[PDB]
Amino acid sequence: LYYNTIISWIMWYLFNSFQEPLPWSDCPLNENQTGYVDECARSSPVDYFWYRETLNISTSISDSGSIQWWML
Amino acid sequence: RVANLKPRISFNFFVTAPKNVSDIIPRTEVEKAIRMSRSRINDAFRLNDNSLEFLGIQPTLGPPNQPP
Ligand SMILES: *[C@@H]1O[C@H](CO)[C@@H](O[C@@H]2O[C@H](CO)[C@@H](O)[C@H](O)[C@H]2NC(C)=O)[C@H](O)[C@H]1NC(C)=O
Ligand SMILES: *[C@@H]1O[C@H](CO)[C@@H](O)[C@H](O)[C@H]1NC(C)=O
Ligand SMILES: *[C@@H]1O[C@H](CO)[C@@H](O)[C@H](O)[C@H]1NC(C)=O
């Protein structure tokens, strides 16, 4: 049951290939295009692609949200 | 007018009126003139914006909105 979710995460990184600037290579800009997103600058851009653009993770196991369509 | 030249390759400069040494152009207007022609000064020396820095003028623009 859970090893089919790891393969679900693996083929998400396979679909986000086939582009020369990889999506985990640089930080996005926020609203005014003057600085980076705040948690992409304190952390790493790769560490930002996992927790916010793949998982959209929460701060606890008690706080849960919606189904997160792409992952589905 | 160039001052304080070093081996690392650094100096200070300010700009005066063409034949009036008492009339120093203000620094906030020299910063706007350099921003308008920074890509043209970079090409004249084969440097690219990180090997020719101005210490108080930082590059700003450019959205990376790639995919349609
Ligand atoms: C050279 O530039 C100076 C500015 O630094 C001019 O001085 C001004 O002169 C007018 C009248 O002569 C005064 O009302 C201003 O107050 C002066 N400016 C300052 C900052 O004191 C000077 O006139 C210029 N010389 C020439 C020949 O153009
Ligand atoms: C950053 O963007 C906000 C709007 O999202 C704007 O109000 C603010 O002035 C911008 N900051 C700068 C320094 O441009
Ligand atoms: C998940 O992403 C959506 C937008 O895709 C955002 O509105 C929401 O705040 C995110 N969830 C959390 C817990 O930040």
From Swiss-Prot, chain A:
Which body tissues produce this protein?
Robust expression in kidney and small intestine, with minimal expression in pancreas. Also expressed in stomach, liver, duodenum, ileocecum, colon and prostate. Not detected in testis, whole brain, cerebellum, fetal liver, spleen, skeletal muscle, uterus, heart or lung.
Stated role? Transporter that mediates resorption of neutral amino acids across the apical membrane of renal and intestinal epithelial cells. This uptake is sodium-dependent and chloride-independent. Requires CLTRN in kidney or ACE2 in intestine for cell surface expression and amino acid transporter activity.
Family assignment from sequence similarity: Belongs to the sodium:neurotransmitter symporter (SNF) (TC 2.A.22) family. SLC6A19 subfamily.
Gene name on record? SLC6A19
The places in or outside the cell where this protein is found are:
Cell membrane; Apical cell membrane
What is the disease in the record?
Hartnup disorder: Autosomal recessive abnormality of renal and gastrointestinal neutral amino acid transport noted for its clinical variability. First described in 1956, HND is characterized by increases in the urinary and intestinal excretion of neutral amino acids. Individuals with typical Hartnup aminoaciduria may be asymptomatic, some develop a photosensitive pellagra-like rash, attacks of cerebellar ataxia and other neurological or psychiatric features. Hyperglycinuria: A condition characterized by excess of glycine in the urine. In some cases it is associated with renal colic and renal oxalate stones.
Extracellular topological intervals: 16-66
Q: How does it assemble?
A: Interacts in a tissue-specific manner with ACE2 in small intestine and with CLTRN in the kidney. Interacts with CLTRN; this interaction is required for trafficking of SLC6A19 to the plasma membrane and for its catalytic activation in kidneys. Interacts with ACE2; this interaction is required for trafficking of SLC6A19 to the plasma membrane and for its catalytic activation in intestine. Interacts with ANPEP; the interaction positively regulates its amino acid transporter activity.
Q: What is the protein's name according to its record? A: Sodium-dependent neutral amino acid transporter B(0)AT1
- Residues passing through the membrane, by range: 1-15
UniProtKB/Swiss-Prot annotation, chain B:
Q: Which part of the entire sequence is included in the shown chain?
A: 671 to 738 of 805
Give the record's PTM text: Proteolytic cleavage by ADAM17 generates a secreted form. Also cleaved by serine proteases: TMPRSS2, TMPRSS11D and HPN/TMPRSS1.
Tissue-specificity statement: Expressed in endothelial cells from small and large arteries, and in arterial smooth muscle cells (at protein level). Expressed in enterocytes of the small intestine, Leydig cells and Sertoli cells (at protein level). Expressed in the renal proximal tubule and the small intestine (at protein level). Expressed in heart, kidney, testis, and gastrointestinal system (at protein level). In lung, expressed at low levels in some alveolar type 2 cells, the expression seems to be individual-specific (at protein level). Expressed in nasal epithelial cells (at protein level).
Region feature (Essential for cleavage by TMPRSS11D and TMPRSS2): 27-46
**What's the domain remark here?**
The extracellular region of the ACE2 enzyme is composed of two domains. The first is a zinc metallopeptidase domain (residues 19-611). The second domain is located at the C-terminus (residues 612-740) and is 48% identical to human collectrin.
Query: Which biotechnological applications are listed for this entry?
Result: An engeneered stable, dimeric and secreted receptor with combined mutations that increase the affinity for human coronavirus SARS-CoV-2 spike protein shows potent SARS-CoV and SARS-CoV-2 neutralization in vitro.
Task: State its location(s).
Answer: Cell membrane; Cytoplasm; Cell projection, Cilium; Apical cell membrane
Q: What is this protein called?
A: Angiotensin-converting enzyme 2
